[PDB]
Amino acid sequence: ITGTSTVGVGRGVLGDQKNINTTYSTYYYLQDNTRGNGIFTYDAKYRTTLPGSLWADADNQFFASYDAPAVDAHYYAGVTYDYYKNVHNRLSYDGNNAAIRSSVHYSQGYNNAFWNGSQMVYGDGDGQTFIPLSGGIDVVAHELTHAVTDYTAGLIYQNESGAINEAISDIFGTLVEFYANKNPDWEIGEDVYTPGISGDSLRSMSDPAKYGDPDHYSKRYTGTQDNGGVHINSGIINKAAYLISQGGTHYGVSVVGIGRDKLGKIFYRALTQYLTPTSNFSQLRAAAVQSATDLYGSTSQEVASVKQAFDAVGVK
Length: 316
Ligand SMILES: [Ca+2]
Ligand SMILES: [Ca+2]
Ligand SMILES: [Ca+2]
Ligand SMILES: [Ca+2]
Ligand SMILES: [Zn+2]
Known about the structure:
By secondary structure, the protein is α+β, with helices and mostly antiparallel strands. The chain has helices at residues 68-88, 137-151, 159-180, 225-229, 234-246, 260-274, 281-296, 301-312, and strands at residues 4-11, 17-25, 27-29, 31-32, 39-43, 53-54, 56-57, 61-62, 100-104, 113-115, 120-122, 187-188, 203-204, 248-250, 253-255. It folds into 2 domains: 6-154, Elastase, domain 1 (Roll), CATH 3.10.170.10; 155-315, Neutral Protease Domain 2 (Neutral Protease, domain 2, Orthogonal Bundle). It is built from 8 helices and 15 strands. Strands 4, 5, 6, 9, 10 and 11 form a 6-stranded mixed beta sheet that branches. Keywords: Calcium, Hydrolase, Metal-binding, Metalloprotease, Protease, Secreted, Signal, Zinc, Zymogen.
């Protein structure tokens, strides 16, 4: 809507207070004009029609329980935008400040969230498996990262290319979580997964096998479920990324860690410069080796560490 930029205050899914950029014109709308062509958050009202209605509020205070998933979808979209702009010089998901749209309260008790080719969409969870999913900064950044991939590599959402697509989202979801510096970790979805169980998460990058996912190519899933295991075989790539950053030994292969920032640089360049819609794991390794070579040189520690990390997970 046309209006004036304003600043409201509210509480997110975890009960934390934060300021949000809004727009005033009769109502206060969840419309942040400070980032690119804007960040817009919508109410899906428990339906599956999208986007729903642009979120309108009478007083610019967002403290109702119904408000919490919207506050966080809106705020964390902002943090993710800031990460890509400040860290990678990328303006929104298309690199041309495309408007970012999210819908919350999607369907009833919906235990998922997704990027649908046009926008991010968040369920409220059923209160057992999940609480509203936009409460997870890694979840928001994971979904917005699918948009980045759509506009760059275009990794097909099946088999190996799909597992890379997924890992790319977990990698940058995590790097955004670190960027915000709010209880950061190498787990995925821990802030919104299973409110009845402490200490678990949907996936682990540091130890994928913790939650049933492979951490070596020899243990890859070869069947047809989950689009050929896109959320399963992502553990192999997640593990390699974790190792590149943090180092360690894994199946008797030693990796010298180079830190998060360089991991982010190498994988961002791989995603935007080398990967293609049909890239496989082997091709990802090559893309990452080439990216590290461009940035740090062929004889660098960074290149050597990329090779050791892929060696460790059995990807040549
Ligand atoms: Ca209000
Ligand atoms: Ca965390
Ligand atoms: Ca996390
Ligand atoms: Ca839990
Ligand atoms: Zn995903």
